[PDB]
Amino acid sequence: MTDRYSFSLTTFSPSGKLGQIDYALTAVKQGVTSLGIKATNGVVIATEKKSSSPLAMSETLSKVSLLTPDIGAVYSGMGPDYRVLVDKSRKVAHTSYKRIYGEYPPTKLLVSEVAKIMQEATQSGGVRPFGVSLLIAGHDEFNGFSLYQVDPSGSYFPWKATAIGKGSVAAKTFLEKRWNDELELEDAIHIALLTLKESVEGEFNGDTIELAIIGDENPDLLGYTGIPTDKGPRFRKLTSQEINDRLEAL
Amino acid sequence: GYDRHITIFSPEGRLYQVEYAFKATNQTNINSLAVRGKDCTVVISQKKVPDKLLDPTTVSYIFCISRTIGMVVNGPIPDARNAALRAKAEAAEFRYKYGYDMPCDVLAKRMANLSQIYTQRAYMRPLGVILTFVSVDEELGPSIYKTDPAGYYVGYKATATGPKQQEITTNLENHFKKSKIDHINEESWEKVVEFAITHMIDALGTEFSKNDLEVGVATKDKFFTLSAENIEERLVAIAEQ
Amino acid sequence: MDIILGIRVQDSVILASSKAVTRGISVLKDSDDKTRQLSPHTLMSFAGEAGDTVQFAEYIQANIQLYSIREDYELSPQAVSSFVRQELAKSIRSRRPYQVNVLIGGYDKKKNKPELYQIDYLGTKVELPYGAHGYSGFYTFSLLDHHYRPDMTTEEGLDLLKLCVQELEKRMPMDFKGVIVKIVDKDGIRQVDDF
Amino acid sequence: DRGVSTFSPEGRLFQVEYSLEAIKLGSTAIGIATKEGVVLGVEKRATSPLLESDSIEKIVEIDRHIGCAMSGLTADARSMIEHARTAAVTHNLYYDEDINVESLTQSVCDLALRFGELMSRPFGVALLIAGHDADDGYQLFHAEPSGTFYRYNAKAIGSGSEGAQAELLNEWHSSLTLKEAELLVLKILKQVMEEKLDENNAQLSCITKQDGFKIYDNEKTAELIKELKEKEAAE
Amino acid sequence: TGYDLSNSVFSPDGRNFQVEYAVKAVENGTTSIGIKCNDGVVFAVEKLITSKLLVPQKNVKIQVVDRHIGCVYSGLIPDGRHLVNRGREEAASFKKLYKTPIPIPAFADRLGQYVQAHTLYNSVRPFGVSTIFGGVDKNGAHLYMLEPSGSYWGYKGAATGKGRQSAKAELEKLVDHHPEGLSAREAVKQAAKIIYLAHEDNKEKDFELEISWCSLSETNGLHKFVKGDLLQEAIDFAQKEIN
Amino acid sequence: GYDRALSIFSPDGHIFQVEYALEAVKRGTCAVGVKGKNCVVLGCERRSTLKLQDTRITPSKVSKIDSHVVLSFSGLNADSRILIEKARVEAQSHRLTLEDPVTVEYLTRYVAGVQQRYTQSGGVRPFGVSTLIAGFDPRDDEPKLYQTEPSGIYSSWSAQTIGRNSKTVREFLEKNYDRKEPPATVEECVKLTVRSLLEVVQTGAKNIEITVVKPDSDIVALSSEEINQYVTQIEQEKQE
Amino acid sequence: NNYDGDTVTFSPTGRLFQVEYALEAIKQGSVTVGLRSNTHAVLVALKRNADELSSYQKKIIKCDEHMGLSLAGLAPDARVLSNYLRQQCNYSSLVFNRKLAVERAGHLLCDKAQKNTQSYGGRPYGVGLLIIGYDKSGAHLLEFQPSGNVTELYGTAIGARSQGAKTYLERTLDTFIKIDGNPDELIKAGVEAISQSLRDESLTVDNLSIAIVGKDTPFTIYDGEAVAKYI
Amino acid sequence: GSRRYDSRTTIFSPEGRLYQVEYALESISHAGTAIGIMASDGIVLAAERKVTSTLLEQDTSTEKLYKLNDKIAVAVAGLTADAEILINTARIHAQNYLKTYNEDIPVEILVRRLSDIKQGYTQHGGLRPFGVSFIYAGYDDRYGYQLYTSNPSGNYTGWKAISVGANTSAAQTLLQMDYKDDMKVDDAIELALKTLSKTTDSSALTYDRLEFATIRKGANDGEVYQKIFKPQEIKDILVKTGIT
Amino acid sequence: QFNPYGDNGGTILGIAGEDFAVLAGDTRNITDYSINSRYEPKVFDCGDNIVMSANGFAADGDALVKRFKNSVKWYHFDHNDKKLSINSAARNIQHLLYGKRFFPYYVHTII
Ligand SMILES: [Cl-]
C-alpha cells in the first residue's frame, strides 16, 4: 500500500493555466446560487436549500454553518467538500488561535487559515483542489463587520456584497444597483431575499431558503449568565417562520 | 484521458470515478426501502439466492453496526463488508471516547467524511456502495440517514435505493402527500413492517415469499433483523386483509 | 580550565587567559592558549570542562567563518555574542550540555567602539567594562571597581591587568602558570608576547 | 512511462542492458593476468589538448594488494571505489588480514542491482579488478552493472573491446612474463585507440606480491613504448 | 478505454476489470471442492501429474489454519499460500487476545477484508485464487468460498477451478437428494467421486487425489488429512462410479 | 517521499536528463579560466540584455568558497547557489576536522561528487551547472584550475571555458595558450583572458568580469575601469 | 502487450507477463540437473564461460551442511535467495537446535518470491533453483520457479535444452532411485542425464560441476580434477 | 501503479529548460503589473489590482503589497495564495534572524532564503513550483535602499527600477527611458504611476484599481518608515501627479 | 532489583606447545554454594582447528561461543571455504566482545 502519489496532480499547462483549479471553478459554477450582503450594523448570507428528494429532510442538511460565535459560512459547489472544510475551519480556529490567545480569531485571519488549507490541496501530493467557493461573513472588535469570498485556488477577496454559483453574474448586477453604504441589516435581508428569488425556480419560502446573519450580540443564545464581558454570539440562523414574515413585506 | 481513472476533475468539473462508483451500486440488482414509525424505524431489502449450493442464512446485506444502529447496503458485498467493519469500529470507539452511544446521523456523517476523502485523495478509490443507516435515536427519535460514494448524506422521512428506486420513491411520496405527516402513524413495529412490504409489492409489482425478503427493525435501545419465520408471519397478515 | 579575564578600555578590549592545563596532580602543559579568533575583529576566550571548551570554541569559530564567507562581511561583536548565547541557551536543555564559560572581546568597526561580553554555560549574557569567569572575579572585581576608569588607554589597561594577575598569583591556591594576553582593537587582534 | 526494474520479453532487465551500451562508448581498459603479476592499462582519451592528462584517474588503488581500472561513465565509479576501499580496510580491521580479491569483487557487485523506485539507476561503468592473495594467487575480475563478475586470464572493456579481446585470445598463454604482459597491453591499446599512443594519453599499472599495486610513471611507460616500437620493427 | 490497465479503477460499467482478470487465472487452475456434512466439512482437490518424476503424496496442496480450519484453493498457488499465511496470523492474534479458537465466520471475514483490501489500490495486484475453506466451531460446521474480489458466502457445497461447472452440477444433486443431510464418511466418498467426474475437463494428464476433513465425531473437530485405507476406499468408490 | 527515477538510461546508453542539463549549461553566460605561472584568472560574461541593473547588489558570477579558492559557473543561476553553499560548508568542515584548508582538487572532488549523486538519486534532477574551480593549495605556489559538469566528471585544465559560445573561445585558447611557457605575469594572464572573451562578448564595457587569484589567499576582483584599459590596449594593437 | 509494464498487472486472460518474462531468463541459462535416490541426492551443473580467457560461472551454492542448490538464470538473484536460505537454515539451528526441513525450505522460498509478484515497484526473481538436501525424512530434491511454484521431485532439469535430460530421467526413474549406498553410480546417472542436453560442446574438466549430499555425507561441491573421474 | 499519472514537474526539456518554471512565468505574465523604483532617499512600490468590482471592499483589501518586517516589503505578481505561503515563511525567517543575531535581517539574505525555497521545488519533491514573482523593497545599514526580484525558478537579481507581471516589456522600456540615478522619491512616485497609466489594459487608471507604498528615510531622524497608502491617499497622489 | 549477571564458577587453562596447544577446563558448574552439574562441558571445538572457552557467567559464555561458531560458518560462506586462522579468530572475537562494551559478556575467554 502506502500513498505513492507524492507528486502534484495540479500542474501548469503551456498556456500558464492551472487546469484542476479552473475545472474546480467550473464545478462551483454548476453549484446552487449563494450570496452575501454587508450592512452598516450587520452582514447577511443566504442560499437555496436544493432538496435532492422530497422524502429527504432538508433541515438535517445545513448549507449555512457556524464557524465561531461571530463568524458564519455558506458555499456554492460540492457539498461534501464544504462539509469537511467547515470541520477543519472550526478546528483550526481553536488550534491555531483560541488555544493560544484565549479568544476567537478575527474574520480575516480565520479566512486566511481556510484559504491556506485550500491552497495546499492545489499544490500538495496526490490530491485534487476543493470544488467549492466559500462566502464567510463575520464580526470582530477591531475590524467590525466583514464579508469574504474564498475560491478553490485559495485566493480570497473582501466584498461589500457578492454572489457565487449558478446565477452569480445576474445576481451581482442586481446587487450593484441596490447596494449602498447606508444600509441597515433589515434592508440587506430584504435585498438578499429579492436577489435570491431570481435564481430560484420552484418553491420560494422559509423551508426552501437558508439564511443567517452576523448582527447584534444575542445574550439569550449564550446559555449562561454571570459574566458581563460575555454577551453572546453575533451569528444567528434565521428560522423558517422569521423568513416567511419578511416574505410578506416583499 | 487519465482524468477518468483517478479522482481528479474533468474539464466539466466532474469526477468520473465517483459517478462510476454510483453505477457499481446497482451491480447486485437489489432494491431496499426504509420507513419510520412512531416508536420504530423499519428497513426492508430484497433477498436473492440464485445458486442452490449457497447457504442462504449467510446471504445478507443488512448489518448490525451497534446495539442501536442498523445498516443496509446497496452495492457489492466486499465493499459492503468493508464499510460495515469500519462503521462498527467507529461506533465502538465513539462510545469509549465520549461516554455515550454514537447517534445514527453522526455515524452517517463520519462515514460520509471518509467517503469524501476517497473522492479527493487519488490513492484511495471510492467504495461502490450506498449506506442506509437506521435507528431510534434517543434525541431525534426514529432516524434514517443515507450515505453515497460522493460523500453526500442527508436525513430522510423515508427512502429507497436500488435499480427500481424511483418507482418505490414515487409510491412513498404519494402516500405522504395523502397522510400529510413525516412518518407511518402506527403503534407496533409489526404493522410498520407490513406497511413497508405492502408498498414495496405495490411499487415493484412483484409478490414475495418468506425467502425473497430481508427485514431489519430499529426500536428504542436495540436494532434487530427478522428471521424467515418472522417474515412469514408478516406476509400472512398482509394476505388476510 | 581556570582563569580568564577581560577589560574594555577606551579604544580596545584586552583578554587575559591562564596557560596551565592540569589533570589531577600534574600540570601537563604551561603554554596553553585558551582562545579562538572568531573573526578579524572578534576574539573569544573560554574556560570550563575538559574537551567541551575547545569543541565548543572551534564549533563557534567554524560557524562565524562560514557566515563571513557567505556574506563577504564581518558580523558585529553584538551579533556574534547573541549567536553564541543562543547556542549555550540551546545547550543547557540538551542531553549533555556544553559546560563552557566564555568572554567575547570585539571591536565594532561600524560604531568604532570596543565591546566585551561575558557569557556563562547557561546562556547568561551581559555586556561589561570588565569581566571574569570562575573564582577569578572574587579577587579581580574589587581592584577593577577601584582603578578602572572608562577612558583609559591600552597601556593603562595592561598595567591594571598586571595588578589583577599579581593579586591572583598572591592569593589563589592554584598555580595557573601566568597568562596569555591579547588585545582587540580597530587594527585587529594581536598577542602581547611579554607579560 | 515504465518501471526501472522491468524485465524485457527476452528475460533481461532493460536498464542493465542499456547501461552496457553506455560502457561500450567508454574509453578502452585492458587487463592481463600472469604468474608474475597482473597488468592493468587504460586509454585516457582527453577531450582537448588544454586538459592536463595526468589528472585523468581511470586506474585506482583499492588496497595494497588490489587495483582497479574503469570504463564508461567514470563518475559512477567513485562510490564503487569508496565502497571497495572501505570493504577492504573493514575486513582487515575485523580479521587482521588481507581480504580475498574475489570477496572484494563480490562486495562491489552486491551494490550493482540495488536500484529501484536505494539508487535510482544501475551504474554506467564496468570495472576490471586485479589483485593478489595467498589462496588463489594473481587474479583479474570483470565487474559489471548486472551484478555479475567473471574471472579472466585477460580482458578488455570499453569501445575497442571486441577487437582487443580477439587479439588477447591469440596472444595470451600461461607462461607469460610481466614484461611480456606490459608490452602486450601497450600493443593492443595502440591498435584500438583513435589517437596515436604515447605516455600522456595512455597509462599502465601492475600488482605484484612483493611491491603491491603500483601506477606506472610516464617516464617508465615511455620506455616500454619505445621498447615496443623496436621489437615490432625487428620483424 | 484503459480502465482495465490499473487495479482499483472503476470502468464506466462500475466494474473492476483487474479483479475480473484475476478470476481468469482462477478458472485456469485445477479443480478444488468443498462439501458441508452433518457435523463438519470435507475438502478435496485435483493434483495434475505433470510428470512421472513428481513424488506421489508429497506436493501437498490443502493447508491447515490453526488446528480446526482447512483451506484449499484454485489458481495461482503462491497467492493461496500468501493468503493462508495471513489467515494463520489472523487466527493467532484472535486466539491470543480472546483465548477461544477463531470462529469460522469470523475467520472468513478476516480473509475477506484482506482480499478486498487488494482491490482498493493500484500499488497492489488482486489475489489470483478462489479459496474454499471452513471447519468446526462452537456453533457447528461451516463451509465458505472466497473470490478475488473479496466476495464470500456460506455454502452447502462449493467448487472452483477448470472443472467447476461439472462439480457444481454434482454438488446440486447431493443437496436435492439429501435434505436431512450427509455424513462425514459419505462426504469423503462423494468428494472423491466429484473430483474424478470433474477430471474430464483436465483429461489429458492423469491426476492424484487429495482429501481432508474436519468432523465433530470422526476427527474431534480437528482438521486431518484422509490417508491410507480410508483414502483408498474413497478412490475405489470413485473409480467404480465412473465405470 | 517523491522517489521517481528521473535520470535513467535510454536504449542507446544515454542518460538524457544529464545530457539536457548540459544544454542548460550551453545556454548559460560564458565563463573562462586561465592559469599563469604564479596566478589563475577567472573571466565571466555578463549579458547586456539586462540594463537598469544594480551592480552593487546583483549576485556576482565568481564566488569565494574559502579565502584561497574561488568558483565560477555556467548554467542555471539558482542551481549554482546550492552547490556553492554545500562547497562552503564542506570547506569549513574540512578545516575543523583536518586542521588544514581544503586543496583545490579536494573541493572539486566534493562538488563533483554532489553533482554525480544527483544523477542517480530518486526524485531529483541533475544540476544544470558546470563549474570552474580555481585557487592555490595551502602553503603551495602551484596554480590550480579544475572543471566539473552535471554528470559528475571532473578534471584539471591549463585553460578552459564553459557556457554559450565556449566552442569559439576554446578554439582561441587552444592556439594562443602555450604549455611550455604560460602567462608569466598577472598582466599577461588577464590580457589573454580578456582577449578570449572579446571573441564572444560583444561590447567590452560592463559585459566582462575579471577575478584574479594569487597564492596565499590573495584574491581581488578588477573594476570596470581596470578592465576597460585592457580592452583599449587589445584593440589598439589589433588595428595593424 | 499493454499488460506487461509491471508485475502488478494481470492480462485479460489472467496472465502475469513480467513473471513469464522472468521465467524466460531461466530458459536462456545453462543446463543443470538434479536427481536423488533414497540415501543420496545429487546436483549436476553445466557451467558456462564468457570466452576462452574467462572462468566458468559457478552454478552450485552451499546453504548448510545438509542442504544446497544449483542455479539457472540471473546469478545475483540466486545469491540473494541462497543467502536467505542460509539465514533460515541458520535460524532453525540457533533457535531450535534443529536442521531445517527441505520441504519447509521450499515453502520459505515460495513465499519470498511471491511477495515480489504482487507488489508495485519491485520485480520477480529472474532465476530458477534446484535444491537438494538430506533431513530427518531422507533425501530430497526440489525445483524452484520465480513464479513462486516449488515442486518436490525424484529428478529434474532446468535451463537451456533441459527437456533432453528430463526425458532421460523419466525413463531411468526406476533405475536411479534404487541406487542406494553408492554415490559414484548416482553421480554417473546424473552425468549421463545432463549429457542428453549437450550439443556441439562436451563435458570437460573445468566445464562440469557436481554436488552431493546424503546419509553420512555433508553437502560438498566437486570442481576441477575432482570431476575428471566422471568424464 | 502511480507512475502512470506523474507529470514529472522537475525535469529538463531537450532544449535545457524547466517546463514548469516556464509555464509558471507564462501565468505570471497575465497578472496585474507591479513596479518598483529605487531612489537615493527611498523606494517606491506601485501595483495594479486586476479587474476589480465596485462592490469590492478596497480599504480592507490586500492582494499586491505585503509587509515582511518594518524594513522590508514585497509586491506580488501571480497566484496570491501561493504568495501568502512564501510571505509567512519569509516573515518567520526574518524573526529567526532577529532572535539569533539581535539585528534586523539584511535584505539580500531574506531574498536569497525565499529564492532558495523556490529553487527546491524545481529540482526535487515532484511538486509544482510557486506561480509567484516578487519585487522586494527593503533597507539595511550595509547596502542602504535595495530592490530585488525573484521568480519561480528561484533566480533573483538586483535592480534600480523593475516591473513584474503583465506588460513588463513595455513597462521596462518606459522606465529605462525616464529613470535617472540622482532621482528622488517624489519623482519616482510620479514615474511609477505614469508607467502604469500607459501600460495598463484598463481604459483609465483610478485609485480603486491601485495599491501603492513607499519606504522612506523620511522619518524623524536616522530611521526608516514604511507607508502603505490608503485609498484616499492614492486618490490624492493621482490628482497631485496630474493623472486624474 | 533485577541483576542480569550471575557467577557459574569454574576454571580454565590454556598452554601453547612448540607444535601443539591445549585448552583445559573443569566440568563443574555452580551457583552460590550449590552444584548445578558435575559434568557440563566448557571447552568447545569451534571448527578450523580452533578450541574455545568463555568462563564466568555461563549464559554469556554460551552466547559468545555460539556466536563465534556462527562467525566461522559465515566466514566459510563469504570467503570460499577459507580456513579461519587463529589470529583472525582472535580479532573477530575482540569485535564480538567490544560490540557489547556497555553491557558486557561477563566472561574470561581463551582460545
Ligand atoms: Cl470526520
Q: Distance between CA D84 and CA D89 in Å, rounded? A: 9
Per DSSP, the three-state class of C88 is: helix
All chains having 3 or more CB pairs closer than 8 angstroms to chain D: F, G, H, I
Do residues F39 and F186 touch, judged by C-beta distance below 8 A? yes
Q: Inform me whether the C-beta atom of residue H2 falls under 8 Å from chain B C-beta atoms.
A: yes
CB contact under 8 A, B122 and A5: yes
Q: Distance between CA I43 and CA I55 in Å, rounded? A: 9
Residue E37 domain boundaries:
1-243
- How many residues does this entry show for chain E? 243
Q: Distance between CA G65 and CA G99 in Å, rounded? A: 9
Do residues B194 and B237 touch, judged by C-beta distance below 8 A? yes
Contacts of A135 by beta carbon, 8 Å cutoff, 6+ apart: A34, A35, A36, A45, A73, A74, A75, A147, A148, A149, A150, A162, A164
Q: Distance between CA C145 and CA C130 in Å, rounded? A: 9
Cα angle value D207/D211/D215 (rounded, 5°): 50
Q: Inform me whether the C-beta atom of residue B121 falls under 8 Å from chain H C-beta atoms.
A: no
Tell me which residue has cell 584500438: D192
Angle of helix B104-120 versus helix B77-98 axis, rounded to 10 = 120
Tell me which residue has cell 478486498: E116
Q: Distance between CA E144 and CA E152 in Å, rounded? A: 7
Which strands make up the sheet holding D154-157, listed edge to edge?
A: D154-157, D29-33, D38-43, D202-208, D212-215
- Residue D196: half-sphere exposure toward Cβ, Cα within 13 Å: 2
User: From the centroid of its chain, how far is CA D215?
Assistant: 13
Do residues A148 and A108 touch, judged by C-beta distance below 8 A? yes
Domain tally, chain E? 1
Cα–Cα distance list, F104 to B91, F109, F145, F150, I12 (Å) = 67, 9, 8, 19, 59
Q: Inform me whether the C-beta atom of residue H13 falls under 8 Å from chain A C-beta atoms.
A: no
Q: Inform me whether the C-beta atom of residue A27 falls under 8 Å from chain B C-beta atoms.
A: yes
Which strands make up the sheet holding D66-72, listed edge to edge?
A: D59-63, D66-72, D125-133, D137-143, D149-151
CATH at residue D152: 3.60.20.10
Cα–Cα distance list, H135 to E86, H115, H120, H160 (Å) = 59, 12, 20, 12
Bridge partners of D40, per DSSP, are D31, D205
Q: For F1-240, CATH number?
A: 3.60.20.10
Asked if D touches B (at least 3 Cβ pairs < 8 angstroms), the answer reads: no
Cα–Cα distance list, E119 to E71, E73, G118 (Å) = 22, 19, 12
**CATH class name, domain G1-231:** alpha beta
Q: Distance between CA C23 and CA H207 in Å, rounded? A: 77
Q: After which residues is chain B broken (C to N over 2.5 A)?
A: none
- Domains (ranges, CATH) in chain B? 1-241 (3.60.20.10)
Per DSSP, the three-state class of H148 is: strand
- Taking the CA atoms of residue D16, residue D17, residue D20 and residue D24 in that order, the dihedral angle to the nearest 10 degrees is -160
Q: Inform me whether the C-beta atom of residue E81 falls under 8 Å from chain G C-beta atoms.
A: yes
Q: Distance between CA A74 and CA A196 in Å, rounded? A: 14
Cell, residue E164 = 467447476
What are the residue ranges spanned by the domains of chain G? 1-231
Set of chain E residues whose Cβ sits within 8 Å of the Cβ of A5: none
CB contact under 8 A, H5 and B123: no
Which of E186, E180, E187, E183 is CA-nearest to residue E217?
E183
CB contact under 8 A, G86 and I77: yes
Q: Distance between CA B155 and CA F44 in Å, rounded? A: 73
Cell, residue D20 = 552496457
Contacts of I85 by beta carbon, 8 Å cutoff, 6+ apart: D97
Q: Distance between CA D148 and CA D139 in Å, rounded? A: 16
Per DSSP, the three-state class of G210 is: strand
Do residues D207 and D37 touch, judged by C-beta distance below 8 A? yes
Q: Distance between CA E96 and CA F61 in Å, rounded? A: 68
Do residues F3 and D117 touch, judged by C-beta distance below 8 A? yes
Asked if E touches I (at least 3 Cβ pairs < 8 angstroms), the answer reads: no
Amino acid sitting at position C68: S
Q: Distance between CA H46 and CA H211 in Å, rounded? A: 6
Cα–Cα distance list, I31 to I9, I28, I36 (Å) = 7, 10, 7
Domain tally, chain A? 1
Bridge partners of D133, per DSSP, are D137
User: Distance (Å) from the C-alpha of residue F133 to the closest C-alpha of chain H?
Assistant: 22
Residue E30 among the catalytic residues: yes
User: Distance (Å) from the C-alpha of residue E123 to the closest C-alpha of chain A?
Assistant: 6
Q: Inform me whether the C-beta atom of residue A30 falls under 8 Å from chain B C-beta atoms.
A: yes
Set of chain E residues whose Cβ sits within 8 Å of the Cβ of A126: none
Cell, residue A225 = 449568565
Cell, residue H212 = 501603492
Residue of C nearest to F69 (CA): C69
Do residues B146 and B135 touch, judged by C-beta distance below 8 A? no
Tell me which residue has cell 589573454: F192
Which of E116, E149, E160, E175 should we substitute to test contact with B (largest number of B Cβ atoms within 10 Å)?
Answer: E116
- Report the first-to-last Cα separation within chain A, whole angstroms: 59
Do residues I51 and I90 touch, judged by C-beta distance below 8 A? no
Amino acid sitting at position B90: E
CATH at residue E209: 3.60.20.10
Q: Distance between CA I6 and CA B200 in Å, rounded? A: 80
**G residues 30..59 contacting E (CB < 8 A):** none
Which of F232, F238, F217 is CA-nearest to residue F65?
F217
Rg, C-alpha atoms of chain A: 19
Q: Is the dihedral of CA A100, A102, A108, A110 positive or negative?
A: positive
All chains having 3 or more CB pairs closer than 8 angstroms to chain E: A, B, G, H
Q: Inform me whether the C-beta atom of residue E120 falls under 8 Å from chain B C-beta atoms.
A: yes
The 8-class DSSP code of residue H5 comes to: G
Q: DSSP readout, E97-117?
A: HHSSPPPHHHHHHHHHHHHHH
Bridge partners of E158, per DSSP, are E34
Which of C128, C122, C121, C123 is CA-nearest to residue C14?
C128
Q: After which residues is chain D broken (C to N over 2.5 A)?
A: 117
CATH at residue H66: 3.60.20.10
Experimental method: X-ray
Which of F105, F150, F104, F144 is CA-nearest to residue F127?
F150
Cα angle value B124/B128/B132 (rounded, 5°): 115
Q: Distance between CA A4 and CA H2 in Å, rounded? A: 6
Which strands make up the sheet holding G155-158, listed edge to edge?
A: G155-158, G32-36, G40-46, G208-214, G217-222
Domain tally, chain H? 1
CATH superfamily ID and name for C1-195: Aminohydrolase, N-terminal nucleophile (Ntn) domain (3.60.20.10)
Contacts of B181 by beta carbon, 8 Å cutoff, 6+ apart: none
Q: Where does residue A178 rank: exposed (0-12), middle (13-18), buried (19+ CB within 10 A)?
A: middle
Cβ density class I20-58: b for 16+ within 10 Å, e for less: eeebebbebbeeeeeeeeeeeebbbebbeebbbbbbbbb
Bridge partners of H227, per DSSP, are H214
Q: Distance between CA G30 and CA G20 in Å, rounded? A: 18
Set of chain D residues whose Cβ sits within 8 Å of the Cβ of F127: none
Q: DSSP readout, chain I?
A: -----------EEEEE-SS-EEEEE---EEETTEEEES-----EE-STT-EEEEEESHHHHHHHHHHHHHHHHHHHHHTTT----HHHHHHHHHHHHHTTTTS---EEEE-
Do residues I65 and I50 touch, judged by C-beta distance below 8 A? no
Q: Distance between CA G164 and CA G158 in Å, rounded? A: 10
Cα–Cα distance list, H148 to F59, H36, H78, H139 (Å) = 11, 9, 16, 11
Cell, residue D46 = 582527453
Which of E242, E153, E154, E233 is CA-nearest to residue E193?
E242
Residue H155 domain boundaries:
1-244
Which of A74, A77, A145, A134 is CA-nearest to residue A106?
A145
Q: How far is the CA of B106 from the centre of ligand 1 (A)?
A: 9
Domain tally, chain D? 1
What are the residue ranges spanned by the domains of chain F? 1-240
Which of B14, B29, B47, B48 is CA-nearest to residue B214?
B47
CATH at residue A190: 3.60.20.10
User: Distance (Å) from the C-alpha of residue D186 to the closest C-alpha of chain I?
Assistant: 34
Contacts of F137 by beta carbon, 8 Å cutoff, 6+ apart: F68, F103, F104, F105, F144
Q: DSSP readout, chain B?
A: -GGGTSSS--TTS--HHHHHHHHHTTTT---EEEEE-SS-EEEEEE-----TTB-TTT---EEE-SSS-EEEEES-HHHHHHHHHHHHHHHHHHHHHHSSPPPHHHHHHHHHHHHHHHHHBSSSPPPS-EEEEEEEETTTEEEEEEE-TTS-EEEESEEEESTTHHHHHHHHHHHHHHH-SSS---SSHHHHHHHHHHHHHHHHT----TTSEEEEEEETTEEEEPPHHHHHHHHHHHHT-
Residue A2 domain boundaries:
1-250
Tell me which residue has cell 578545516: F95
Tell me which residue has cell 553584538: C78
Q: How far is the CA of H102 from the centre of ligand 1 (A)?
A: 45
> Of residues E30, E119, E160, E219, which has the active-site annotation?
E30
Q: Distance between CA F82 and CA H113 in Å, rounded? A: 11
Which of E194, E161, E141 is CA-nearest to residue E30?
E161
Q: Distance between CA F67 and CA F62 in Å, rounded? A: 13
Q: Distance between CA A226 and CA A219 in Å, rounded? A: 11
Do residues H43 and H107 touch, judged by C-beta distance below 8 A? no
Residue D79 domain boundaries:
1-235
User: From the centroid of its chain, how far is CA G101?
Assistant: 16
Q: Where does residue E38 rank: exposed (0-12), middle (13-18), buried (19+ CB within 10 A)?
A: middle
